[PDB]
Amino acid sequence: VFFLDFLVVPPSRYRPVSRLGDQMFTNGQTVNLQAVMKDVVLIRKLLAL
Amino acid sequence: QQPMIYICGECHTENEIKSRDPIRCRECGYRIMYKKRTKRLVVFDAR
Amino acid sequence: MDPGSRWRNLPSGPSLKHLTDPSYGIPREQQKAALQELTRAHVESFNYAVHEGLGLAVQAIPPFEFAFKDERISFTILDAVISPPTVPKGTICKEANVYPAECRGRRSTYRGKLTADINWAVNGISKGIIKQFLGYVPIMVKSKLCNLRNLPPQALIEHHEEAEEMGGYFIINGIEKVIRMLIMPRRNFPIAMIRPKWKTRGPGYTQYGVSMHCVREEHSAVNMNLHYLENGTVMLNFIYRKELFFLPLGFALKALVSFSDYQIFQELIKGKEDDSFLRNSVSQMLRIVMEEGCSTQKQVLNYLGECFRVKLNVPDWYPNEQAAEFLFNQCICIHLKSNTEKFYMLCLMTRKLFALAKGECMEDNPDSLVNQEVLTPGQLFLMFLKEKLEGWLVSIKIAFDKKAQKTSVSMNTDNLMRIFTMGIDLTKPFEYLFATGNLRSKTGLGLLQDSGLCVVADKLNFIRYLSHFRCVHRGADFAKMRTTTVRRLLPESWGFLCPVHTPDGEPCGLMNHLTAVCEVVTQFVYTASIPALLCNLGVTPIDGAPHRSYSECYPVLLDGVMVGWVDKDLAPGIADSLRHFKVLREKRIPPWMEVVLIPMTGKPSLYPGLFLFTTPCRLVRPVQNLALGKEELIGTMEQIFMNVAIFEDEVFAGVTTHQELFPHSLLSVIANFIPFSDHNQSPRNMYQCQMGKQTMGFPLLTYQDRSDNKLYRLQTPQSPLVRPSMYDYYDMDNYPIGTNAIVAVISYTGYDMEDAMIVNKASWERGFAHGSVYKSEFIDLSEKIKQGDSSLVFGIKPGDPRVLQKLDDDGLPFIGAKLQYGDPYYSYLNLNTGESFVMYYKSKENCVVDNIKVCSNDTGSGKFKCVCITMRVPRNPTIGDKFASRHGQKGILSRLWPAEDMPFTESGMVPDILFNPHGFPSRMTIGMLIESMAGKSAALHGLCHDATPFIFSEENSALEYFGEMLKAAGYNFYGTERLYSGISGLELEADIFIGVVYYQRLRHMVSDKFQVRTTGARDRVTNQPIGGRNVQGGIRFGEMERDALLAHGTSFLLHDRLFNCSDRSVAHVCVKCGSLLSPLLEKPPRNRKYNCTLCSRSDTIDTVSVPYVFRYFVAELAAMNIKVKLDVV
Amino acid sequence: QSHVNIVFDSEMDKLMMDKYPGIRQILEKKEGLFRKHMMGKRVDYAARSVICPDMYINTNEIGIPMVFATKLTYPQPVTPWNVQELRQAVINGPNVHPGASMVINEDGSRTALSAVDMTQREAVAKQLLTPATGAPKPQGTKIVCRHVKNGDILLLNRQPTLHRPSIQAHRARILPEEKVLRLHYANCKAYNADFDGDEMNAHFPQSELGRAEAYVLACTDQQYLVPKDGQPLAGLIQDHMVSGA
Amino acid sequence: YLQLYRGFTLGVEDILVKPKADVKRQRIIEESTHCGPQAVRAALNLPEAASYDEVRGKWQDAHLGKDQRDFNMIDLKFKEEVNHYSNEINKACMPFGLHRQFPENSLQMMVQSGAKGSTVNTMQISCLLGQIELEGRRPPLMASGKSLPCFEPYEFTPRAGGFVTGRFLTGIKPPEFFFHCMAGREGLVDTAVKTSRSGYLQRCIIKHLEGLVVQYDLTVRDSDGSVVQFLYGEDGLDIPKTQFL
Amino acid sequence: SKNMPWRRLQGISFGMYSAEELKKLSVKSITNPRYLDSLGNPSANGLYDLALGPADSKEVCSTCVQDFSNCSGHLGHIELPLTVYNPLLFDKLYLL
Amino acid sequence: MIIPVRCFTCGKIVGNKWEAYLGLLQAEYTEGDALDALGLKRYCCRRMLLAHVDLIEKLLNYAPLEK
Amino acid sequence: KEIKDVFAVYGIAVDPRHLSLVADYMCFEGVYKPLNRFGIRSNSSPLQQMTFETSFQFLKQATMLGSHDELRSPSACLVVGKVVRGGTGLFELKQPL
DNA sequence: CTGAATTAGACAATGCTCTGTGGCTCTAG
RNA sequence: UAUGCGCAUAACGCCACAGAG
Ligand SMILES: [Mg+2]
Ligand SMILES: [Zn+2]
Ligand SMILES: [Zn+2]
Ligand SMILES: [Zn+2]
Ligand SMILES: [Zn+2]
């Protein structure tokens, strides 16, 4: 438990997007999870290389 | 029947404006136009 | 008094003859010059910054050079002009000029057009000049660039502006926004201060250090610090692009001049010749540079360019000598332009540091106004504009960098200067500052503040609107800090900042206001003749021998330039000669010069020297020089060595040098509108300056031309019968904010105790204090209704039963019309589809449509999609509305009392406002009693009394005066009458004080404050109610309410308020393994059973009752791999 | 690793832009999760308005406007000994005081009463007190969400809530054509209120448990002495201590 | 009673002072003009034949000094010297020497029956404002040693140090107006700053002491059973009910 | 209708999870960094995937079949390719 | 803005006295004598006309039609 | 005595029973303990420690130590939506059958 | 050749509730 | 969830200013 093999995505009803007339706005939790996930994709391509 | 009259802010000339035409005064080209007040019944209390 | 004096037309008493004059309502041939001087700082600073400061700023931008493939390319800006606001090109109009009423009603920005004559050169030869468009910069109204300049009041009425209209504001998106005057340090002056936080900055730094705020022609600003180290060594702090750099003093002093080390030594020990600790310290500082192989000026410049080239970012082909010259031009004493003058000013700052650290002079207080000045709007405009021009050149270089990386086909630049179009356009970064107040800089512009630089100049009334141009703000960083020492009223701001006019609460003492006589120096002059004038007097030049010991001499400073040294037996003679020349305007000495001679006491007083200031942005005020008999402008530092007198009686020969213009010149414009303010307690005058600005008054005269969000209008306002003479000097009957009321001070009804008040019902039913509020809603079909296809126009589908006889044929309500809740508000139809939509009126207040203006774009090519409906909401005074007198006596209306039940006097008169006499003892507003006696005399005799403060002494009292007036009118000397009871019929045994008090109606109404929430919307994360009354939300039952309800012992009442009435959710737990996260519903084959995902058994799942925020809590802890195990028993 | 740190705690990683607040900043501070949404909460069935004085209500009473009285409801269940009162309240409807906003049926379905036609509200008032219908839920009766009337208890409150008499339960007295709450003068030292523009929160308890411990425990009559030192804090003020003397 | 039969008001006849008492007041003010240098010689311990330039030189030495203990002693002796004239003026005007006495005086009936106000307020209306005292000291001096631009540097008179000796009945001259504005602003800033210091203290004490309730054995126990007191308050009694014991 | 809860929390305990216990709790491995497509719907294998809860009332779930008003919400996991520290325990890991 | 029809305190018609008041003041009466010649005896009536600022002549310089 | 001397400068008389309870709490453990986030470390309830200050550090300690909360604190009963033990919650009502 | 007290740095806290408006939330490469 | 008539539309934060008690 000192180490992570995976993050945990909390349920999507606790991470709602706040739209106001044809513009979506993501909250911070989904953005930090996405900044993990883009880097995960980058490492996965680099280990493929 | 009963055209929509708008009044220019500067020259105060009366302007008919339809839906599709660009809005500017037909004489002086000014950009703000005020809507004309027409005769229509409104009831107020004197109180 | 004195001819040509700006305060010679101040009236001896208030007249009331202008209200009934036959020339009333006829607009004058010229604007009243009393009102034009309230915004004169704003206008004149912007006028300098746009015409002359812009030329000086574009001469200050260095020729920008960079690297092509083969040859260096040089860009320089030869000229920059700002054009007045006109229509775009290709626009068919009769008038090319744009006026602020269009930009204010269409909600646009009133923009000039910045264009520059950029020259370019390849291989050192100038190939061609390019006139090039940069962007649109905003224009201050009634500047030299506004189109309302030089117009008479009839011509301002013609262009839908106010007669008597001053402008210190920008229209940014239809909104008048003012740049309030910030407090900066005193420019070009060494402020010796003590800060213990400087000890945490280096290894042996002391708390002592001399700050310096250098500005160059109001287009640059650089803060720098000398620091004192415990071995007597001085470090030189300097900031370059918001980051600090620490240099020993010998490197700077040895790089600035080609002097010998002994000659630099003699300049630093120059006052204190015999202090051997200083002698060893400055020989050690000069030895530090010698030890690092820097024996000439050129080697120091080479070393300093080597060490600062990475952070500094010159082209890589400059020498290191030039790279150090660049930092000494951008960072070190930038107000000087010569390097030897930088040496002498930096030696003076070091000598002041040595005197501070040896305990021999005293700390210049940064909080005293002596050491402070103002940031004017033209200065901020011009600094930000210079930074954006430099950034524009850098963007052109990045454009050539992109075309060298991407399109490197080696096309020569043979008028290939449509790459300027590929440069940045500085319209949007320039409008962001004026639209938000937030400062996005890479330099920081020498300010210590990042935000709050532009504020909406709203026009609730005219008393509030004047306060944006007189406000001097201390800083936004100080409201967060919990100290009470920057919020003190210090005596050095006598006559410069007002003592009463400041807010209450968080900005109290920070948001200060100028006095009525105070004014900001905004003129700029050539001071090339002044040092030769000083040397014609006894001031020896700084190179020549002073013919006496320097310990018996004064350092002379002319605007941050150390001119020389004066024999201390000659320095009062030189100071009196300069004041003589200043007040008589003789030897091109400016009338706004501060001639400060700080004397040599021989004690730890201020650091002595003859300081001479002629720069702008200083506060300056008129007194009268009694020796000359003429009016003199004295400054803030100059004032503390003068003995002004207030009254004629206080003038003593040989003691008082000066005298004020009038004894109430210590007060604001706004604080001079309080009647008899020297009889009130001072918090009650501070409250009136605040709530005089919250008054529903008469804001303006152009109601159809003004499109702003709310606008509070009093219906029938009256001139006060008892007002000061400043009320008539500033012609405040153009915009009156109150009504005279027959106020009786009686404890009669039971509803007027504890600040509440009673209004006669029959006066309210007649026109007393009736009002309106004009709400303007700007409807744009592009901005809000973004569905696609960009072809929405207001209109109806003909034959629509949703809009029949309720909207007009253009889908837009009638102008006489009323609007209840749920009525059709506007209709718009899609032209490429055919479908018409209707929008409904969602406000809960019945309004009447006032006007509807329809807007184009900037070209006259816009389509019928922008509109601006303005609606009138009635807002007559109800129970719960707040009134006020002019003395700080606020009060909620508790009761509208009938006229038959009101106590009638023996004259046959009821009051229309009852006042409870218990608002007097703890508050001591005696001026309200004098105002009522004075207003009753003013009504009876048909007069208008003077209520200017400080005109009544103890010998000739105010109550004696107005009692003799009431006695002459056949009334009581003490203001009381024989009232009867309207409920009983009997004459009341007491003798009731009644008069005429001028009341004000504040804009805080109960119709904007009540709210009730039964059920409604919930927050989508926690399922608790939402906040706000416009979104129809809930109120908090916070932590202290939880605590106070725990103290009652009512536990089911907390369980009610905090579980049943916020979020009672039902979760499913596995009772075996204790987990909310574990149950899961089966995919259907019905059955609808749950399975614990962990133990795979469907038997152990049952419901509990948790808050929904507890479920959000356990999910967010599961996101951190924290297990929450429940004991469910 | 620093992206995962920012997911858990957006202050563990310095020197990185484009971060948003992590789970620590969801939890820790003012405007956190505990202090903003667990220890204090937004709440339904409450009101807030400016207070004005009133002497001609009792000391234990509050003056509720018709603005609030026709909007704050209480879920009164229908028993055979109060069905005439609730039936008249259903007939009056949601815009006539004393009335009712809705009728909650026995299965949890909320029959909203109509402000327009009296025919629907007459049909609902006939249909009260009938036994368990064709739906197999016989456990309960209907609930009529009737308006706050004279005598209902309401917790009043003024921020900052510094001691225990800063929240007291007042009986309601319904006053027409106003928008202010009417408070007696004997309570103003307790709430520290002085009618210069103060506002007060009126929470309306929705259970018989909350009502019964607001009548007994948190009543105004029981808050006569301050808990600080047992001295009185309800008493007459300014005009009264002059005319009694 | 205040509606029907008696009225109640506050005129200017309730705050006026008789002419003979005003002559006494004015000559005590004239004597108060001259009590300057004795209060400086008393604090600096100088012989009474020392010149006015030597006393002023040593008071320029007490000021401009990092010790700041001679200077506070000089302010203390000035405040003690002018408190004598404050008390003489308040004797000369307040009980007798008012135009009306209690009970016919309405301001005295508000003060003395406890309705509203204090005796200090009535003395400030009718006698003097007295010494203006910013943070326990006389109002500050400028860096040149003068208290306002209308006064000399290191002037001995009490008028140049905040002793107002004007009243709200007849007005306040501009220097005393500025000193009084210093004092009013420090009062407003002080009440702005007290609240955030008093709130965090109460929050911390609440979050520790919240679990302590009296059990059914009469022991004040924490929420975990830890016994804090064996009888509440060492006798077991309730504070609102010990008042008549 | 009938009060669905009559059980009662007696206590709450804080601990950590094993990774096997989350991998039993998780319903979808989340892979796609793009939340929404061009047509506005949530993606497959993205952070707003419908194997988690719906984020609004306009959709239903995939694991259960309920709408937004009855779905409890479901956990997903981003399977990291390589091992990172746990920031809750990094100080105690440094000390150990 | 415009002269009130009645006095606020008592209901005396004061709206018909504004042009008479201006004609008396242009005929060189004192304002006290001009208020006496209109029969304004109570000072409630007398401040309604004494303190009236007539903003409608300033507010009609912006008259729109200018024709 | 020191709290009485603080309040008695200002003419304020807090009753002696409040002061005796506060001093008996601050001296419960044999040492004079502050009422701050360092004296709340001794508390039995992790949720009360989280709702007071530095919620993430007490959460981290409760997760490391495996701390149990008995849900008898007034903060812990309001986190989980349970009726608080003081006042009308020290007892339960039973219906005789 | 290592436990010792000390000192600098890091960090966490700093009253409560309520009402509005206005700009921006992904512009730069 | 609110409005309107089961149906149609609207479903927000962060800063900064200003204000109330
Ligand atoms: Mg108040
Ligand atoms: Zn036109
Ligand atoms: Zn299980
Ligand atoms: Zn689901
Ligand atoms: Zn009248």
Numbering used by the authors:
A (entry chain A): 296 to 344
B (entry chain L): 12 to 58
C (entry chain B): 1 to 1085, 1092 to 1135
D (entry chain A): 395 to 639
E (entry chain A): 788 to 1032
F (entry chain A): 4 to 99
G (entry chain J): 1 to 67
H (entry chain A): 1623 to 1719
Could you pull the original sentences from the published paper?
RNA polymerase I (Pol I) is one of three eukaryotic RNA polymerases and is specialized in the transcription of ribosomal RNA (rRNA). rRNA constitutes 80–90% of the total RNA mass in mammalian cells. Pol I transcription is the first step in ribosome biogenesis and thus plays a key role in cellular homeostasis. Our structure confirms that human Pol I consists of 13 subunits with only one subunit forming the Pol I stalk. Here we report cryo-electron microscopy (cryo-EM) structures of human Pol I bound to different nucleic acid scaffolds as well as in complex with initiation factor RRN3 at 2.7 to 3.3 Å resolution.
Subsequently, we used the DNA–RNA scaffold, mimicking the elongation transcription bubble, for the cryo-EM structure determination of the Pol I elongating complex (Pol I EC). In the active site, we confidently assigned positions of all bases in the DNA–RNA hybrid. Human Pol I EC structure represents a post-translocated state with an empty i + 1 site, allowing accommodation of the incoming nucleotide. To our surprise, the cryo-EM density map showed features similar to those of double-stranded RNA in the exit tunnel. The 5′ end of the RNA oligonucleotide used is self-complementary to the 3′ end of the exiting RNA oligonucleotide, and thus we placed an ideal double-stranded RNA helix (A-form) formed by base-pairing of two separate RNA oligonucleotides into the exit tunnel that fitted well into the cryo-EM density map.
